[PDB]
């Protein structure tokens, strides 16, 4: 109907790009996220991606079914967490923005290297700049205080270094590039504990990178 | 569409959360109750850092702490408790202060008395680089507050 | 740094008085204690003849009289806000008078939280113990025996923490104490026996019982009536065992009651002070039975008239009553036997000069002869006035305004003061009494429960007649005022800052900056600029208008189109209240972040935050002594000098403003202003005059290193000779003291102490100077005293 179209093309598009959108763009992978009691406290997990899929394939029958889905997404975050948590602030900001917008609701190696250059250029876009920014440049061992990072990681890597290497044609074949990117992510995994939010961002960006690189010619 | 200053404050807060040397002011301090620092918008972390209300112990090891609650002489309200003295006597006591401190004390006493307690290396270099790269290589706390001061002056 | 602080006009507010046979068993004495002063009087049919005034090193907050057995005359108990306590005796020997200290000591506990309702002191009628209440949940007792000359105390736990008031009771086999305590269930009276043997409480004579929610005073009736009366906001009750009596006269329901005293030693008649000035009398009507016993049967309250707002009352003789004041004039009144032409039974006899509470002051020279004159707003509510002070001892004119003054500024081009003020009206609003705001030659209004309304007054310098009064918008509060010439415009304007108020808002979200001009004997608007906040102060800055709106410090420029335009801003403060200027620099004082220092850069157009002071203080007024020395005062009754550090190794050490001096003034400072009170055309340099809430007007100057070293040694030598009354060590009196930290005084010479050297006898002077001569030092003292 008209309201479903409005939600799909205005509200959904607006909330899909907001700088606080990325954490809610996928199901809550409790096992990876180390959430023991989460799956006992909420009986109806929900996420923006589920909403987009339902809207795109007309899973709904009534428009309010998607509104209650958004409200449930806010409600689960509110219930599980406590005031003062960053996710709580993100949920509050999203809720107020939705309320602002809802009021308007109407009544062949060369081919592989080319592909890898395209992928790396994609990873630099503003489309993912919300949560891919930690890796844009080499991790400074002095400007962030990580004394041991020099020792625990033996091969620092970052997207700028990979871009420079590609511009210099240092990669004889795409397999080296893939190994370098996977090393870049694995270093972050190995250094930090799983709780640190950086990992969440690394998992997101690596999911995107794999989705793109699996299509290498 | 989050504003640039809000986005920068958000990054500052998130990164600072994991620093074991960061010692933010107690969330129950009176400032958070008298509405002198807005708790909703993330920008207040910069305003704190501007005033040295929140500081890094590695750079500033001996900062005098900010009192949790004002002495009752300047607000007339004891911690999270309705005053014993009747309103009229309070009003007669506030008439002795000057014209400005009188208004400030009246405001504080009208606000705090309805408060409710809320149940509860060094990263400075990179923060200062992010701030300056937003407004425009070894730094310390001083060059962080000095940069946040200019950012606030030219942004708010 | 170095400085020199001296007292010019001794304080004149009254915060405690008592009557009894102090100086002799034959005489009757009225004892008035004012801050760090103790005044003694003798009552006579003519009036009061002062016999002795003695200053003490400590803010006297608890004063009482008692006559222990074996003494031919009373003794005086003094407890200061610094917890120095002593017991005094008035000893006379021919024409010489001395105050001899019987016992002295300190009763400050190591830990605790002082109570909200303030220190309380009370004495047993039989003189077996001295009661005190210095902390929540603890009662501090002091056994009264000749042996306890060092005042060794012992505590006793209190069941309930929130004690409103406590008193002793007359006529009990052992000391008994009654008080009012609050808890979630309400407010209750209660009783105990204070056993001096077990050092513990025991259940008292009668039971706890509920009282009116605002019950806030306790009176202990003497024999035979017994019991105590609980004075409330809307009713009065009398409790004694099974006896119980109450009265709720509508007459007192209009206003609260603040003080009381006993008239007849038999307890039949009491006086109750009122916040509106009324002076009620409370009658106890007795009843007797066949058993020969006496009991109470009814209570009556009647209105006698009007007097100054009272902080304490007392009865002397033949209906002569003394009314002390913290907000007005201290009056002696006669209580006649019949109503005097208006229903008032009250007539004044003599009036005393009281200056505080000063809320502003500016130094001018109306004679235009180079002679100083201070004009000071004073008083509150129906006792507001302006006290014009000029050097002779001082001559103190008066001008009643019958409304609250807030600010003043001198405007020479038309020779008239501009004064803000505020009266009180009761919700449509109605006036309570005539006042300058409606008694002026001409009036106009702005048109662009008790509720305040604020007026701006123009007062002529020659006659102090209220030339004109301007009323500000509804609910709007005027906060700051200044007179200056802006930019190139040859006119002279009044500028007033205002802040709107509403019940829901916690931080004011609207305000105005208004520009007025005075010519042709009339007052009219010229320019107004709306701003998003209150305006705590404004200053003339090299032709530009410098203001602070909430936390921001702002700078305005005066166009040729008669409007204010923004130049540059600032945002690094919690709440900026005070401002001062000298050349380019700006000294912003914040609510809690002490003093911030700026420097305006002409060739760039912005403020450079060159320094700060990080120690947390609660500032009240701030001023500049020179390019690099800053003075500031805080409600803790201290002064501290902030100095931009000269030697620094790092960038960080150039941000700290060091607190190079600390001094415990003993007064709440309220405003600073440059000026002096002697003719000019010497050790000290510069001058600054500051008001106080207790009326004490003081002077601050700078000293050169050599003079500071000399006067420091002179000060140390005096304390080994001057027999301070109460044996309170000088350094403890003048030590910086707050809730957080304590520090010995440094950098400030105690003016009042040095001048006292002029009084000691010649042998004492010789002993003082030993290891030079007195005259070579008497000259030094003389040069110093000439500054006031
Ligand atoms: C402390 O220095 C270190 O560690 C080493 C170093 N540090 C950084 C670094 C550190 C932290 C951050 C950062 C960035 C963003 C955020 C953030 O936005 N935080 C909100 C949040 C909270 C929870 C989740 S969630 O996904 O976990 N939770 C969750 C998800 C979904 C749902 C629905 C729910 C739900 C419900 N209903 C309840 N919870 C949920 C998701 C998001 C937090 C931290 C950024 C960078 C760093 C670099 S390079 C560099 C320049 C820097 C600054 N660097 C690399 C690379 N490697 N190491 C490091
Ligand atoms: Zn640091």
């Amino acid at each position: 109907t008209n309201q479903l179209q409005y939600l799909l093309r205005v509200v959904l598009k607006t909330l899909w790009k907001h700088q606080f959108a990325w954490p809610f763009q996928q199901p809550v992978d409790a096992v990876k996220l180390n959430l023991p009691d989460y799956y006992k406290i909420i009986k109806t997990p929900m996420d923006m991606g589920t909403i987009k899929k339902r809207l795109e394939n007309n899973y709904y029958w009534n428009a309010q079914e998607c509104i209650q889905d958004f409200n449930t997404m806010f409600t689960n975050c509110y219930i599980y967490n406590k005031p003062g948590d960053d996710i709580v602030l993100m949920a509050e900001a999203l809720e107020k923005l939705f309320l602002q917008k809802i009021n308007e609701l109407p009544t062949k190696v060369s081919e592989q290297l080319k592909c890898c250059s395209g992928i790396l250029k994609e990873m630099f876009a503003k489309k993912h700049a919300a949560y891919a920014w930690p890796f844009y440049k080499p991790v400074d061992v002095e400007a962030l205080g990580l004394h041991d990072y020099c020792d625990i990681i033996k091969h620092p890597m970052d997207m700028s270094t990979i871009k420079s290497k590609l511009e210099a044609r240092e990669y004889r074949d795409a397999q080296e590039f893939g190994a370098d990117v996977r090393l870049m992510f694995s270093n972050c995994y190995k250094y930090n504990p799983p709780d640190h939010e950086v990992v969440a961002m690394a998992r997101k960006l690596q999911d995107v990178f794999e989705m793109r690189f699996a299509k290498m010619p | 569409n989050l504003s640039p200053l809000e986005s920068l404050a958000w990054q500052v807060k998130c990164l600072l959360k994991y620093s074991t040397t960061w010692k933010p002011l107690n969330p129950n301090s009176w400032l958070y109750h008298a509405k002198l620092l807005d708790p909703s918008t993330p920008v207040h972390i910069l305003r704190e850092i501007g005033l040295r209300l929140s500081h890094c112990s590695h750079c500033v090891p001996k900062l005098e702490p900010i009192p949790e609650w004002p002495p009752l002489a300047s607000c007339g309200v004891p911690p999270f408790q309705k005053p014993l003295t009747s309103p009229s006597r309070l009003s007669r006591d506030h008439a002795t202060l000057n014209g400005a401190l009188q208004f400030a004390t009246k405001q504080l006493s009208r606000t705090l008395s309805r408060a409710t307690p809320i149940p509860e290396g060094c990263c400075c270099g990179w923060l200062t680089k992010t701030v300056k790269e937003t407004t425009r290589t070894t730094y310390s706390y001083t060059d962080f507050q000095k940069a946040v001061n200019k950012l606030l002056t030219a942004s708010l | 740094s170095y400085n020199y602080v001296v007292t010019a006009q001794k304080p004149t507010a009254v915060n405690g008085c008592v009557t009894g046979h102090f100086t002799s068993a034959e005489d009757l004495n009225l004892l008035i204690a004012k801050n760090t002063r103790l005044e003694i009087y003798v009552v006579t049919a003519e009036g009061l003849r002062p016999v002795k005034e003695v200053g003490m090193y400590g803010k006297i907050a608890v004063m009482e009289l008692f006559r222990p057995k074996g003494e031919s005359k009373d003794l005086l108990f003094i407890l200061t806000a610094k917890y120095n306590a002593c017991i005094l005796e008035y000893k006379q020997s021919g024409e010489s008078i001395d105050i001899i200290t019987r016992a002295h000591g300190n009763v400050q506990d190591r830990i605790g939280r002082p109570s909200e309702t303030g220190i309380i002191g009370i004495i047993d009628p039989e003189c077996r113990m001295i009661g005190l209440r210095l902390y929540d949940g603890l009662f501090k007792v002091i056994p009264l025996d000749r042996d306890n000359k060092e005042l060794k105390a012992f505590n006793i736990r209190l069941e309930e923490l929130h004690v409103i008031d406590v008193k002793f009771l007359y006529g009990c086999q052992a000391p008994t104490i009654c008080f009012v305590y609050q808890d979630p269930q309400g407010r209750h009276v209660k009783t105990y026996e204070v056993s001096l043997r077990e050092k513990e409480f025991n259940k008292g004579p009668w039971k706890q019982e509920n009282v009116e929610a605002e019950a806030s005073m306790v009176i202990a009736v003497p024999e035979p009536f017994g019991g105590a009366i609980i004075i409330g906001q809307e009713s009065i009750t009398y409790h004694n065992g099974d006896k119980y009596l109450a009265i709720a006269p509508p007459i007192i329901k209009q206003s609260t009651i603040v003080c009381h005293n006993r008239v007849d030693p038999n307890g039949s008649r009491y006086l109750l002070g009122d916040m509106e000035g009324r002076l009620f009398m409370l009658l106890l009507e007795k009843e007797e039975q066949m058993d020969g016993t006496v009991t109470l049967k009814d209570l009556r309250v009647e209105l006698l008239g009007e007097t100054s707002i009272a902080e304490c009352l007392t009865y002397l003789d033949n209906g002569v009553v003394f009314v002390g004041s913290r907000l007005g004039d201290s009056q002696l009144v006669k209580l006649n036997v019949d109503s005097n032409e208006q229903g008032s039974y009250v007539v004044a006899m003599e009036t005393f000069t009281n200056l505080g509470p000063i809320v502003d002051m500016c130094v001018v020279d109306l004679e235009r002869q180079g002679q100083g004159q201070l004009v000071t707003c004073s008083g509150a509510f129906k006792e507001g006035s302006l006290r014009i002070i000029r050097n002779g001892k001082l001559h103190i004119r008066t001008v009643p305004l019958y409304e609250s003054p807030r600010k003043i500024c001198y405007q020479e081009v038309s020779q008239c003061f501009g004064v803000l003020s505020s009266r009180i009206e009761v919700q449509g609003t109605t006036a309570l009494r005539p006042s300058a705001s409606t008694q002026a030659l001409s009036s106009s209004v702005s048109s662009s429960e008790e509720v305040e309304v604020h007026n701006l007054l123009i007062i002529d310098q020659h006659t102090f007649e209220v030339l004109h009064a301007h009323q500000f918008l509804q609910n709007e509060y005027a906060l700051s005022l200044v007179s200056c010439k802006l930019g190139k415009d040859p006119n002279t304007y009044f500028i007033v800052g205002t802040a709107m108020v509403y019940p829901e808002e916690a931080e004011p979200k609207q305000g105005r900056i208004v520009v007025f001009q005075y010519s042709d004997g009339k007052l009219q608007t010229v320019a107004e600029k709306e701003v998003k906040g209150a305006v705590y102060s404004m200053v003339e800055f090299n032709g530009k208008l410098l203001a602070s709106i909430n936390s921001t410090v702002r700078l305005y420029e005066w166009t040729t189109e008669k409007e204010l335009r923004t130049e540059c801003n600032h945002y690094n403060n919690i709440m900026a209240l005070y401002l001062k200027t000298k050349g380019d620099f700006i000294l912003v004082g914040d609510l809690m972040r002490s003093v911030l220092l700026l420097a305006y850069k002409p060739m760039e157009g912005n403020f450079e935050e060159i320094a700060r002071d990080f120690n947390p203080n609660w500032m009240s007024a701030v001023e500049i002594l020179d390019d690099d020395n800053f003075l500031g005062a805080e409600n803790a009754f201290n002064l501290f000098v902030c100095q931009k550090d000269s030697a620094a190794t790092t960038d960080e050490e150039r941000q700290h403003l060091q607190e190079v001096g600390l001094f415990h003034l003993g007064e709440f400072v309220n405003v600073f202003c440059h000026g002096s009170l002697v003719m000019q055309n010497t050790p000290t340099q510069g001058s600054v005059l500051f008001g106080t809430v207790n009326g004490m007007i003081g002077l601050v100057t700078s000293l050169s290193e050599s003079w500071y070293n000399l006067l420091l040694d002179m000060q140390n030598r005096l304390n080994k000779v001057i027999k301070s009354v109460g044996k309170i060590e000088h350094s403890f009196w003048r030590s910086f003291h707050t809730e957080r930290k304590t520090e010995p005084a440094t950098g400030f010479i105690d003016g009042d102490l040095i001048e006292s050297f002029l009084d000691i006898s010649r042998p004492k002077m010789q002993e003082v100077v030993a290891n030079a001569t007195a005259d070579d030092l008497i000259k030094v003292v003389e040069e110093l005293t000439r500054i006031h």
Side-chain angles (χ1 to χ4, degrees), chain C residues 766 769 772-778:
Chain C
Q766 179 61 58
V769 177
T773 65
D775 289 1
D776 274 351
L777 191 57
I778 289 166

Side-chain angles (χ1 to χ4, degrees), chain A residues 22-24 28 33 35 38 73 76-77 80-81 86-87 90 133-135 139 144 146 188 191-192 195-198 200-201, chain B residues 10 14-15 17-19 123 126:
Chain A
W22 67 263
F24 308 80
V28 181
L33 300 166
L35 304 170
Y38 178 73
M73 199 184 78
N76 299 353
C77 174
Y80 182 72
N81 275 103
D86 300 296
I87 192 72
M90 296 184 80
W133 55 271
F135 312 117
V139 176
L144 296 171
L146 308 176
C188 173
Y191 183 86
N192 289 103
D195 267 307
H196 290 207
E197 248 70 275
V198 62
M201 302 156 78
Chain B
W10 181 268
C14 294
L15 168 56
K17 183 172 74 164
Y18 294 96
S19 304
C123 295
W126 188 84

Side-chain angles (χ1 to χ4, degrees), chain C residues 381-396:
Chain C
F381 312 104
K382 79 180 188 79
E383 296 306 329
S385 51
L386 314 182
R387 313 289 172 144
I388 301 106
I389 304 170
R390 57 188 178 85
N391 206 341
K393 304 176 182 179
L394 300 177
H395 170 72
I396 303 174

